[PDB]
Design a protein around this ligand. Sequence first.
Ligand SMILES: [Fe+3]
Ligand SMILES: [Fe+3]
Ligand SMILES: [Fe+3]
Ligand SMILES: [Fe+3]
Ligand SMILES: [Fe+3]
Ligand SMILES: [Fe+3]
Ligand SMILES: [Fe+3]
Ligand SMILES: [Fe+3]
Ligand SMILES: [Fe+3]
Ligand SMILES: [Fe+3]
Ligand SMILES: [Fe+3]
Ligand SMILES: [Fe+3]
Ligand SMILES: [Fe+3]
Ligand SMILES: [Fe+3]
Ligand SMILES: [Fe+3]
Ligand SMILES: [Fe+3]
Ligand SMILES: [Fe+3]
Ligand SMILES: [Fe+3]
Lengths: 162, 162, 162, 162, 162, 162
Amino acid sequence: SISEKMVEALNRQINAEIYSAYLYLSMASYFDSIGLKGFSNWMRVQWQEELMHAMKMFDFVSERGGRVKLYAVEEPPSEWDSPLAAFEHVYEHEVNVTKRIHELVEMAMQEKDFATYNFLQWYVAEQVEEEASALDIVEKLRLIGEDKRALLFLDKELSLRQ
Amino acid sequence: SISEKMVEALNRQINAEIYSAYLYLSMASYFDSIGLKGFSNWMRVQWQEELMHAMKMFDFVSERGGRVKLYAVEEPPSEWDSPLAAFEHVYEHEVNVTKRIHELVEMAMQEKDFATYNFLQWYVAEQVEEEASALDIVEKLRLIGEDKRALLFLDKELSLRQ
Amino acid sequence: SISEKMVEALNRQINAEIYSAYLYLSMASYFDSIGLKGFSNWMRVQWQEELMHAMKMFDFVSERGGRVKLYAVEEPPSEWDSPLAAFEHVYEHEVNVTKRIHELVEMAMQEKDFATYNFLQWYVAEQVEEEASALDIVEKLRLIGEDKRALLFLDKELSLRQ
Amino acid sequence: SISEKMVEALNRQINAEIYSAYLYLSMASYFDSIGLKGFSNWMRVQWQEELMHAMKMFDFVSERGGRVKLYAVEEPPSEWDSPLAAFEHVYEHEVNVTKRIHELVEMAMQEKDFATYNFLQWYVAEQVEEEASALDIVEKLRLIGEDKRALLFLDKELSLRQ
Amino acid sequence: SISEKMVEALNRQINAEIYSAYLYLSMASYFDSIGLKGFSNWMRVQWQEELMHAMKMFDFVSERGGRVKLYAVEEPPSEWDSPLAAFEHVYEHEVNVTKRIHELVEMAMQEKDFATYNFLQWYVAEQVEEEASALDIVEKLRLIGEDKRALLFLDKELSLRQ
Amino acid sequence: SISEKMVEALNRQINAEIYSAYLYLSMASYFDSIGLKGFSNWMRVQWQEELMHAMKMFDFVSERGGRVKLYAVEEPPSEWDSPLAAFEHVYEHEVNVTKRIHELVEMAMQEKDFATYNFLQWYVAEQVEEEASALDIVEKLRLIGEDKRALLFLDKELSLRQ
Ligand SMILES: [Fe+3]
Ligand SMILES: [Fe+3]
Ligand SMILES: [Fe+3]
Ligand SMILES: [Fe+3]
Ligand SMILES: [Fe+3]
Ligand SMILES: [Fe+3]
Ligand SMILES: [Fe+3]
Ligand SMILES: [Fe+3]
Ligand SMILES: [Fe+3]
Ligand SMILES: [Fe+3]
Ligand SMILES: [Fe+3]
Ligand SMILES: [Fe+3]
Ligand SMILES: [Fe+3]
Ligand SMILES: [Fe+3]
Ligand SMILES: [Fe+3]
Ligand SMILES: [Fe+3]
Ligand SMILES: [Fe+3]
Ligand SMILES: [Fe+3]
């Protein structure tokens, strides 16, 4: 039932979820390098979260009788201009992930593959949260601007994530 | 104090630990594809293990004052002639990972980087277990030869790993 | 079989550890003098911790069959230009302690005194943390420069240390 | 990959650990014979402890891919002029086991067998304790001299070891 | 009052109990050599159990005021054709150990040494179990023959012993 | 992965399991017709049980992503010479159902279809029980013979089945 075309694409998106993890891990290294252990922590938590996103899709492809094929994970970028620019890139990347999910929804429907549609609804809801979390911190870094105490305050708040 | 040479090698090995995890994840797919869910499980656990291995080094490079550069993760192989060949590939890959850790140990000696030498001793000990665990299962699968009832028994046991 | 050369190098290091403690107690007074009770708390904790490093080495010297000679503890300096300057001194000092530790490690290697070589690996690993904890505060102090509200945020953080 | 000459050496040291136990068990019969039930206890405990030392190495030869050959265990001596002489024998014995372990460490270094080098570090630190425990009791027994009431106070203390 | 002839005879039977331990230890190696870590476990446990047998009798000789002499433990054998042959050697060995204990019993009665007779009744019952446990596994392995799965099923049964 | 071959074979076994049900329901009517309400109840319970056997296969064919086709269920026979003759038909019939299952097992193993092999193992075990149960009552009736209080005794006993 699950079509070979639907598998390939889910396999794409599995790779996109892993590269996001890996992107966030590179950011963990960047925030590490500029003293911000709380931001670093957030990123490490996001890395593991995106890996979990990938695995939940890895397991669904196998369950449905599809075959997971893993592809290369690209070398991510490694520097950003500022914590603000880091999170702005998070936001934009997550909006891109949200696009690619909306398309998998659309493909599922064309193929009348109701199981893959229903499953992707998890990721549709999850992307709403991803974008909003990312936006919310972007807004906070914009008011903070150059104010070093506010920056360190946000960094503590972020160190608390699990 | 940590040299650039040494930071490079460690960043490389971090990439290799992540690759190892990714190979084992591939094998988990292979094993799903021939209905050995226990072998699959064993791999899925070893994938989490190797990622953890990677992170302990990722954190160490940054504590030593160096900077983690992340590199592409190679697309891994996707098929194996049999369960025996896949664990034969496992054992061998592990013997190589060991060789890599031994070369890192020697570099640390050459450079008198006592901190990195001591740190690496954990991997010296871990690679002993890695090899032995893989070899034991290669042996089991040799003893089992062609008997598919015995394969499923070993499969159910491997499904018990957490 | 522990040599005289070794027993004296270890006794001198016992003195260096106790002086490191004492130095950090002098910095505690300095930080009290300028209203930074959290910086003061950090130094106090570090003072107990360094005393604890000396005591582990004290016990070991006798465990090996040696005798601890105690030497004078030098009057430490009592003024620094700034928090940043004081923590730059902590860092350069701990880099020097490391350098002494590594000397002992070499001396023990050179003497085939394996028991002492092994005992000191704990100090090899401890010094990694010691340099990192201090460099992290130096860097935060740099990031902060003259902003006194941020300095006070950081003082509060250090008042948490146990 | 462990060499033959390293396996054989380890297996000789397994034998020596077992002999050590057996020597200390003979000593327990000695002490029973002169009514000193605490010195007896101390030895029975150390006979178990040396067996544990042997089994730890027995397991490691197997976990490296080697195979353990077991050897005759020589008939230990059965008499000593006095409690002081028995514990002197214990001391000179343990200093000799330490020598044996140190030779093992050297061999491992020469062959670049880092895995064995690292495993043996446990026996390097254990021998530090073994020498000091036996030495303290030797020194106590010298302090004590021919006083029989004091000897029995020591005997009672030694009966508390578990 | 226990006699000299009895004390020697119990002293030899200890030796025999320690040898049996050592024999079983040798088999543990042999089963470890051929992949059967569950059989190996059984053998480690029997190795401990026979040491407990020896010590119980070591203590009894003491309790009666005899002196335990310790003799060389003999180098054991180290290969067997198969799991079956090994357990046949176990049973035959244990049947022989029964014979020795039935001889100590008849000696005891001859000397009217009731306290040694009563003491030996524990070993008389224990041997009934020793024989019956060995024979049960011989019987099971014959029925098993060359069937690999069934072999592995029993090796897991044996991994359970404590 | 599950073959067309294996699916049609399972669907056919499903038919066989529903027919078994219906055969047992037809006997419940027989036993009802001759005043044996306990035998009837036994059949009604066995009818629900074989329906459950069916549905577990229906669900399994469908989980593995194959399509259950439903075939006609044959008119079963409706009379028997006696309770004994009736339970002899149950036995023969169950021995036949065992034949079919063992055939489904070998086909699975041919196609190396290990999920299906493992799933059928429940039925192999279940059939061992079916046969033993039927056989046992067959035997209890050979004994009862013409004896009427013992037939009513057996009849109460089968009332009890839930
Ligand atoms: Fe995601
Ligand atoms: Fe995301
Ligand atoms: Fe999320
Ligand atoms: Fe690893
Ligand atoms: Fe590994
Ligand atoms: Fe491991
Ligand atoms: Fe220190
Ligand atoms: Fe320090
Ligand atoms: Fe510290
Ligand atoms: Fe020892
Ligand atoms: Fe010792
Ligand atoms: Fe000890
Ligand atoms: Fe025994
Ligand atoms: Fe026995
Ligand atoms: Fe027993
Ligand atoms: Fe059925
Ligand atoms: Fe049935
Ligand atoms: Fe049933």
